[PDB]
Design a binder for this molecule. Structure first.
Ligand code: MN
Ligand code: MN
Length: 269
């Protein structure tokens, strides 16, 4: 079977309970994870150990909190106490875990399932070939010996409009923001980098990225996390918002792909 789970955010206990509920069996089942494995929740270290141990039975995409963790680890950014990353950072196996983490994709595609996954979604200004190439560019920098320089460069909210003639720092920043921070769009597809509230509360003319027709979303289903104020509701057919805010006292959501059946674990907080 195929299972998709939203942002775990260090909620190791809830993740294991949810997986036991569906009797996830490595080697017979595959787990897709929408990223943001770490931060807020108490057990980022345990989540990383477990997910890494799953090997080929897991398909991950990196989120904005995974990339922030890598930036803290590399000395690029300051550790925030509320993230509760210190046990993972100080762990004897931290180098191994994080060198594995930075090697993971930004985008997962399964042609047989007609399924695409990224942390925040697929921006409507991209087709599948462009999404693939941008994923590869950022993955190449993240998995290189020089990744701290990229991580330092990634911060910033501009440029917010895609053009194939984007080059250098601006190109990398747009790709990163589109894959891991995108929520709202302007009518032409421009990224808004400020509003984090629900669609109902969004000021005009902002619309969810998935409310704007795009080539990928017309040929593929898209699963994503990141957007917790969405609370997994209000998406069109073929769009699955799996982030239901476990770390925030909400729930961890699992979707079985074969029958589109949902399973939920309540937050312990
Ligand atoms: Mn996120
Ligand atoms: Mn999140």
């Amino acid at each position: 079977a195929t299972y998709l789970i939203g942002d775990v955010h260090g909620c190791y206990d809830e993740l294991i309970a949810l997986l036991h509920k569906v009797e996830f069996t490595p080697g017979k089942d595959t787990l897709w994870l929408t990223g943001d494995l770490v931060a807020r929740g108490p057990g980022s270290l345990d989540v990383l150990r477990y997910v890494k141990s799953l090997g080929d039975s897991v398909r991950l995409v990196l989120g904005n909190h995974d990339l922030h963790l890598l930036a803290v680890f590399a000395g690029i950014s300051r550790n925030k106490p509320k993230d509760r990353l210190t046990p993972l950072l100080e762990a004897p196996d931290a180098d191994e875990l994080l060198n594995w983490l930075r090697r993971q994709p930004l985008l997962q595609i399964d042609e047989e399932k007609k399924l695409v996954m990224a942390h925040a979604g697929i921006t409507p200004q991209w087709d599948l070939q462009t999404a693939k190439e941008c994923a590869r560019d950022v993955e190449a920098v993240l998995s290189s010996d020089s990744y701290p320089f990229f991580l330092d460069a990634m911060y910033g909210d501009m440029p917010n409009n895609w053009s194939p003639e984007l080059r250098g720092l601006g190109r990398l920043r747009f790709i990163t923001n589109a894959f891991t921070r995108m929520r709202f769009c302007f009518p032409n597809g421009q990224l808004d980098m400020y509003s984090k509230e629900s669609p109902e509360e969004a000021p005009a003319p902002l619309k969810p990225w998935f409310a704007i027709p795009g080539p990928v979303a017309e040929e593929y289903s898209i699963a994503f996390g990141h957007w917790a104020s969405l609370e997994g509701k209000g998406t069109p057919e073929g769009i699955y918002a799996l982030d239901t805010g476990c770390c925030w006292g909400g729930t961890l959501t699992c979707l079985r792909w074969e029958d589109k059946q949902y399973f939920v674990q309540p937050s312990n907080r």
